[model samples]
Target chain A: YKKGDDASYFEPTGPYLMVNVTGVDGKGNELLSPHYVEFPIKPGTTLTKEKIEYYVEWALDATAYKEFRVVELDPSAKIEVTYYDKNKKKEETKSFPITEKGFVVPDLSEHIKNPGFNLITKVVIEKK
Target chain B: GKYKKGDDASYFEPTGPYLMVNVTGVDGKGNELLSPHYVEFPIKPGTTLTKEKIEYYVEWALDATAYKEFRVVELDPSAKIEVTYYDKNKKKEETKSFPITEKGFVVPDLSEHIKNPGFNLITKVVIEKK
Candidate 1:
């Protein structure tokens, strides 16, 4: 299901970036919702693990190991995801090739590096 | 949407690459949702740009939305949107640029580029509120 807010009040607090999220399991079962998740972001604000987790908690399913896919709704805005290697001791980071498709990503299972992995994201603003 | 930069070089650019767009449409509640951003699809190494091609890219991006009334946001009289990606079949990088004109925007023929996907990435977009 989709979600919306008449609350322009939220905008004054900060910029609310809304993205369409699609969840699918190995069996192709669609999971998670309120389908559209809005993140509080600024022009220069980078989407870090904290940022995503903070907002995703509202939409992400706590029970299932579903792949949470994020699609960039902003045509001009680019979203980038940095996945971490959990197995690595020193902290290894793998950045996916950022494209539109809403800055789509792999299964959360693949990006997590254990209980506390480093997940960094950013909205790439084009040069002025 | 994967495009490899120069092979010898590793570690993608910090800002990386992205497609910019101007979008507008109505909401489920009939409320208008017009979104236009300054950073329209940035030019990359293998990217290409054209008015019609950009129209094509933006159209696909809007496909995710319930937005039926789609048109390019006129940022500049000659605003050009460009995308550079490798030609899957040719194994060579190509770039194209297209202009946004006052004549509105072009409606892309999906079947034309559908045969070879990813070739058209330069055009990304926006919807204006009516």
Candidate 2:
């Protein structure tokens, strides 16, 4: 079964990181609708744009949606990211907040990572 | 799910947790040798344990790189398995010997030979030369 198609059947009930991607063209035309892939998370696991790109490449390669290329995060990409912060939830429109080397700025510590919750990230991609 | 280091491969979905059997070699003086070759069997839910099943898993788990002398010769029900586990009732660690036939070698239960967590069960097997 496709990983995204049946989450309950394949994955145990635990924390996961979900990346949702939408593909578009240079003319701003929608090429592919939004699709999401999940990664099981361990406490204190770190997330980076490079790591997310690798996962997107792997997950898409196994499906009919294998043609999209993950581009560098730019203003046009407009990342829509959300997660829990100190028991309060927040959303932001930004490039993945990270150092120039692509590491998440302040690493995801165990305190902020919760079980049974998903850290969702939305990114825009284009066909190579 | 075995792969060489640095090989680019996607992770295969595991059907269930695994049972790892570590088979080591010892010399005539009871001194250990340069071996603790191991094998892992995926224990799917409702899986049964039988001599035939044990042999099948053992064969599949062994790699071509394994030592030639290290192999399953036959399933001996009288063989004693040295099992180590944390005793929940006694609140202490212990090692006990149980004959292979006791639990029928069932998955999860391992023929009821393992009393603690099944996933991390590690046991040893000895080979006697004729």
Candidate 3:
């Protein structure tokens, strides 16, 4: 979400991180179900540890929201986290579902317990 | 690992959000439409090493670690760092490039025991816009 942008927006920030998952240092590393993506994707392409890093890197770029993160579960459920600015001074957390359609960042009006804020996307992932 | 955003000094943790990018040729419309990239390494721990070796390390940062190379800038007195060894004989200076049965992703617990003692991992990596 950006200023003057449509309700649904995707801006390309080159390549940014959007998530990071737990792995098998002892834990059998995994994130979310791969079937959630908006595109045709095989789970094998992204389940690796290296690729998970890109998810985190891109997430750190969130504004108003300062960072994005992915918390992984042993059962392989992953939640996309976005840390952004809520109003003037306070920071807010908004979550999304990591789909092939990138992330469907949750709206602030319902989830965020703060003032109205525009969901700005400085970086958007193009659909393949 | 080199310097990164929000990094104050060498004291930054080596374990972090490090990414391996898969780049494919984009379409004329700037859509990433070729063979899409899969995530490789995520949040790999950078080698945890101080800019300069010190006396005692915090619990989470003790291990048998090697120094690669680094670029240092700025100074933070409050980081509470102190130096005890200035090896003139270059004993610690002797470089070991030989591969040992290298450590995997497991980070050392500072309270337990360290293999070589008083060592850490590296941090931060950056890429220029392609």
Candidate 4:
């Protein structure tokens, strides 16, 4: 979140990665459900491979699912990622391909440890 | 391809995320005869190469590959690019120039050309940044 022009708190919105589950890449890896859960999304933001080794980590909690494969992107759009650099007091923006993860956040880790920052604002899909 | 961007080379050469391409060919006998060469060019920050430029890059790379029986296929119209930078005085500025492709979306498609009996598919495409 950053300071909006109104000087008020401005937190970004979200749309979880919408993927069509296909098959796994290899053995021991389980594919995502037809269409898994919705997690916050940010372009270029990928999943933590190991964490979801045998199952998909929806947020912090792990479950039966493991790995995610993208069959279709559905649609494409240009997404802009913006963050506030407290030290610099300036907002920075970075953008990457936001095609389709069929699966696909924020520095929710920092917040999880500390509590002040935002939580996992995205979804990650991968194979186990 | 050619030194011509309207910018003075002396002031400061812009660093880039650029592209290096290699085009090759295949003969009926499956012999990898043509191994033309590599062509590297700079890509503007927050910008990319135009269709025409990509075409030129491909053509040049094709030289080392199969400069002989090959030819350029279809070339789409040039796109527009938004160039924004700081001026000498540190003033922020921007310009919309036609014929530029954004980064990552920059690779050209030579499907038609490759389909020809003699020409071959693009052997390799690599990104170079230093």
Candidate 5:
């Protein structure tokens, strides 16, 4: 079969772990919305709270208006990551428990069916 | 395509990570005096090509010997760039302004220009007599 015929043929060999941050006010209005941040990661790479926080800071720094600051990643906080499940033929989301340390990124080899897909993690920051 | 922090996929849409511009010369009779010579302008992660950046690329393309047949005439906006890009099923051609677009250069529809598909925009600089 031609390479293009396979769904995964065009998949990025060097995958990225993308993080999108949204800062909301006490009333739930968006206060700081910066661009999504990403970095290359292997399938089994462990994303630490420090690294994730650094990317969050980087996103805030990238924007012109930055009035909000990330407090601290609470242990009770959970990060929801979404990816396509090749087996289920639909998008699937998994919640990973956060710690002061970090959590391992989910392996996407068996999950992603489409080409050029990146592992996306969404984080919401609520301002006091 | 792998992305870095603050990278916008829209900036690279249609064209990959960079925009390939092929510069060539054409005679009044439509004969190709110069073959397709190209220069690559990489998309700056999250940003589109503004007027300044487009001018920079255009200046760079015109300075090269491959596109030496055409020169920018001072005080005259008469210099033309015949842009050819592929729309879904047909090759579309137009005479675009210098620096391409005012709203910033976004990769246009180039689905059918696949033979030399590496280039997203083909600029045929028409030679003018002094």
Candidate 6:
């Protein structure tokens, strides 16, 4: 039904600026493929409901519920129907999209509540 | 058929400019009749109601209804017993139409009796004309 429940690292009172980093290869270059942004908190941290709520909003805003992308990568998969002896079978898979871009949750009017809570850190998105 | 939404039915008189049909059912006396009724096209008269439409008449008994053999009721040449029509749409042609499930009831449904032994109903269409 849903992906998985988890969180990434968290930053407290940022300088309003954070170095945007992504998964990279041995060469140190960002992994050209789109990725899951591990939230900013370690898993074992004893967190509060308020802290979790903060992460939820941040995660939604970060991924736009998969309506946005962070890297220039696009992946596609498909479900195919195959038939044999008058019987039918199907195959299905999921994937990412091509091309990536940076985004910000603008005007969360009545949306943004706090930044100290835990939230979604994984997402799936398509490229425009 | 009964689905998540509901049972779909041919509720009203079937509309037609048909030449042939099969109307089978029983009489009120529990007598059975096998009817492969023949129909005449309105000398371009308009339309005839059959099947579902006819079923609607039998189903007037409501709930579930089953009737005797199908009947081939020939309309009097100059009579307007069948429906005629005209509107801003286009020239009307010979066609068929039936009622929806939401329509009124008639004969008792006996579909199961012919198939299911413990079927609730068994109908007979007693034909009459004025």
Off by over 4 Å in 1: A1-128, B1-60, B66-126
- Supply candidate 2's per-residue lDDT for B115: 32
TM-score of chain B of 6: 0.23
Cα deviation at A112, candidate 5, in Å, is: 1.9
How far does residue A33 in candidate 1 sit from its true spot (Å)? 31
What's the best-to-worst order under lDDT?
5, 2, 1, 4, 6, 3
Give a tens-digit lDDT track for model 2, residues B38-91. 444556536655555555454443332122334555433454435456656677
Error of 3 at B24 (Å): 32
Residue-by-residue lDDT tens digits, candidate 4, A1-128:
52122221333233233222223333424343344333334321333333222222433233344334322221332233355544467766533334333112222111121112112112334443
DockQ metric, candidate 1: 0.02
Q: Rate the local accuracy (lDDT) of all candidates.
A: 0.37, 0.43, 0.26, 0.34, 0.46, 0.26
User: What would the DockQ be for model 6?
Assistant: 0.00
Candidate 2 stretches greater than 4 Å from native: A1-12, A74-99, A102-128, B1-130
Give lDDT tens digits, candidate 1, residues A49-109.
Answer: 4345444444443324223433322223334334354445445443422232112122223
Better of 3 and 6 by lDDT: 6
Candidate 6 wrong stretches, greater than 4 Å: A1-33, A37-88, A91-128, B1-98, B105-107, B111-130
Model 5, span B6-84: residue lDDT tens: 2232434344445565544444444343344445655433555554554456545544432333443221123222334
Error of 6 at B49 (Å): 19
Rounded to one decimal, what is candidate 3's iRMSD?
16.8
Which residue pairs show backbone clashes in model 5?
Answer: none
Best by lDDT: 5
Per-candidate interface DockQ score: 0.02, 0.01, 0.02, 0.01, 0.02, 0.00
CAPRI band of model 5? incorrect
- The reply for model 3, stretches above 4 Å from the true place, is A1-15, A25-79, A82-88, A99-128, B1-130
Q: Interface root-mean-square deviation for each candidate? A: 15.8, 18.0, 16.8, 21.3, 20.7, 34.0
Error of 6 at A7 (Å): 10
